[PDB]
Amino acid sequence: EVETFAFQAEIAQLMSLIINTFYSNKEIFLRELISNSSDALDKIRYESLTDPSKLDSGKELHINLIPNKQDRTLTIVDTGIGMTKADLINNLGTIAKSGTKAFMEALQAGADISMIGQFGVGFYSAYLVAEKVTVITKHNDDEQYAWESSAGGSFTVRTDTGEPMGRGTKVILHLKEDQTEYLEERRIKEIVKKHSQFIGYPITLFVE
Amino acid sequence: EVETFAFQAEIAQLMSLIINTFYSNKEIFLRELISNSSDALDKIRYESLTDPSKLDSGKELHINLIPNKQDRTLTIVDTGIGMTKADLINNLGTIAKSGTKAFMEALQAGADISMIGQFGVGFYSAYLVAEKVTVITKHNDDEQYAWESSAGGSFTVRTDTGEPMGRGTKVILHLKEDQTEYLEERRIKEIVKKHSQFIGYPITLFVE
Numbered sequence: 471e472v473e474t475f476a477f478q479a480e481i482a483q484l485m486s487l488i489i490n491t492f493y494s495n496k497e498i499f500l501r502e503l504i505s506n507s508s509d510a511l512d513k514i515r516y517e518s519l520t521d522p523s524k525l526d527s528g529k530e531l532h533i534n535l536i537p538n539k540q541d542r543t544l545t546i547v548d549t550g551i552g553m554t555k556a557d558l559i560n561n562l563g564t565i566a567k568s569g570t571k572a573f574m575e576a577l578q579a580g581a582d583i584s585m586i587g588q589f590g591v592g593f594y595s596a597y598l599v600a601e602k603v604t605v606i607t608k609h610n611d612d613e614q615y616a617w618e619s620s621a622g623g624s625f626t627v628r629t630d631t632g633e634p635m636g637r638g639t640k641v642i643l644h645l646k647e648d649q650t651e652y653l654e655e656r657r658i659k660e661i662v663k664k665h666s667q668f669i670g671y672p673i674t675l676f677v678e
Numbered sequence: 679e680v681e682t683f684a685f686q687a688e689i690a691q692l693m694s695l696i697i698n699t700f701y702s703n704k705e706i707f708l709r710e711l712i713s714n715s716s717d718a719l720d721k722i723r724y725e726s727l728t729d730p731s732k733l734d735s736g737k738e739l740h741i742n743l744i745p746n747k748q749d750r751t752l753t754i755v756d757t758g759i760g761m762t763k764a765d766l767i768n769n770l771g772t773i774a775k776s777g778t779k780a781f782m783e784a785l786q787a788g789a790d791i792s793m794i795g796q797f798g799v800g801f802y803s804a805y806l807v808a809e810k811v812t813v814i815t816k817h818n819d820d821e822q823y824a825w826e827s828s829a830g831g832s833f834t835v836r837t838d839t840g841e842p843m844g845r846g847t848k849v850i851l852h853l854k855e856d857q858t859e860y861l862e863e864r865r866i867k868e869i870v871k872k873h874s875q876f877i878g879y880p881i882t883l884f885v886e
């Protein structure tokens with residue numbers, strides 16, 4: 471059932487860097503996850519141009535944002551390309567090892583943490599606000615999997631027998647106790663409008 | 679030998695929009711082509727993580743910028759993933775039809791032309807400065823091809839029997855008569871430093 475894996479050394483460093491650095495502009499985590507969803511949505515769209523059955527697992531191409539104050543989670547769901555087990559283990563389809571290096575040398579030469587997305591590892595900005603991230607994903611070529619990590623140098627992967635999702639990726643942010651502003655409808659709306667207003671897919675902010 | 683193709687209607691519109699709109703900040707074309715090269719370089723890098731023979735066609739991952747005042751060309755060469763014949767014909771691997779729509783409605787709601795890259799069709803910003811663009815490309819799964827267009831609603835594709843390139847994409851900009859500032863070493867340097875200083879691949883500006 472559950473496999474446990476070590477982050478590679480540079481990804482572990484990136485995560486501590488994100489967790490431990492004093493840096494007040496945390497809201498950018500949402501931009502980077504929406505933009506990740508948008509890239510995933512482009513890929514499956516591009517595939518379907520030549521093969522329409524790629525869309526048998528869901529014709530709709532969207533992003534949903536789902537706050538839940540009970541569980542203290544904010545979930546970003548897309549119906550993009552999704553990830554195979556291999557992708558998930560390989561740093562969630564990112565080039566996280568070289569991207570971290572380029573990111574850390576950009577911090578040397580003047581960059582700040584908000585530019586993380588330019589190095590391909592914007593996913594990890596999730597740890598600006600989450601103490602634990604769960605990613606549920608399904609790619610046409612594989613089963614549904616769940617990846618999880620509370621950082622600390624390791625992550626787990628298991629086949630997911632929760633809710634069948636068809637195709638796509640759910641990023642589930644278990645928010646830190648002091649970052650609950652990102653479950654507030656007005657706050658999420660302000661952030662989407664600020665950093666994500668031209669995303670080319672409909673973004674639905676669910677209500678509670 | 680030479681096949682001729684019609685641009686789809688929305689891509690033809692995007693190109694006239696780029697060619698005919700009064701818009702002074704043309705230098706952004708270079709950022710968008712370098713960032714296209716950078717995305718291509720990430721892809722082949724990601725592939726090689728699991729299969730190293732993907733790099734048999736060239737281990738080096740770089741961008742070269744090559745001005746030539748004789749021919750009045752500026753060439754952007756990367757050793758990224760490259761494009762198959764199908765990719766080339768399908769709008770150079772972009773989602774140009776939906777990206778144009780999202781781009782044109784972003785222009786409705788306040789965007790300007792410099793934000794073109796956020797809609798996936800930054801390649802076409804090449805027509806800010808070129809009257810004719812030639813793309814030479816080689817992908818591990820296919821032969822070398824040459825795509826060309828002077829806009830006007832059509833493009834051509836032919837197998838390329840010029841110089842074997844190994845793997846990657848050469849974007850050859852035949853500059854408009856009044857845009858030769860982009861062959862000047864000082865100007866290209868200023869632009870790379872301004873918009874592309876954290877690209878994670880070495881960029882070599884060739885000299886003449």
Ligand SMILES: Nc1ncnc2[nH]cnc12
Pocket residue numbers: 506507510548550551552553562563564593639
């Ligand atoms: N939404 C997403 N889709 C595919 N791969 C991802 N890696 C991180 N986020 C992703």
Ligand SMILES: Nc1ncnc2[nH]cnc12
Pocket residue numbers: 714715718756758759760761770771772801847
């Ligand atoms: N440099 C590039 N590599 C692959 N596909 C592209 N489409 C446009 N530019 C490209």
Ligand SMILES: [Cl-]
Pocket residue numbers: 532534674
């Ligand atoms: Cl929905």
Ligand SMILES: [Cl-]
Pocket residue numbers: 740742882
């Ligand atoms: Cl070189």
